[PDB]
């Protein structure tokens, strides 16, 4: 007996009835906290410095 | 012996007396709570949302 984390039964929203909108594939998903945040900057510009 | 919750000898509000306003058919609404509120916007503007 074995099972995993997330559901559909849950309360989410809907655009529709049927529809589920927070797909159930997001198992995989979780990059480093402080890099998806604001208060460190883009690679793109960490580029454009190092190049300028 | 078994019986209901819901009353008509209750004191309740009248238009005039013989008339009973809250009328004692409600026993099936329970939607969920926070559904109902204010504090969730509505299903429409979720889809206007969704949809610009």
């Known amino acids: 007996p074995r099972l995993k984390s997330l559901t559909s039964k849950m309360?989410?929203?809907?655009?529709?009835k049927r529809v589920a909108l927070n797909l159930d594939h997001?198992?995989?998903y979780t990059p480093e906290?402080?890099?998806?945040?604001?208060?460190?900057s883009t690679r793109k510009q960490f580029d454009t410095w190092?190049?300028?």
Do not use: A, H, K, M
């Not at 309360?11 to 529709?16: L, M, N, Q």
């Not at 906290?33 to 460190?40: E, F, K, Y």
């Open 26 to 28: 997001l198992i995989l």
């Open 33 to 40: 906290q402080t890099d998806l945040s604001n208060t460190r």
């Open 50 to 52: 190092f190049e300028g």
């Open 11 to 16: 309360r989410v929203p809907r655009y529709e």
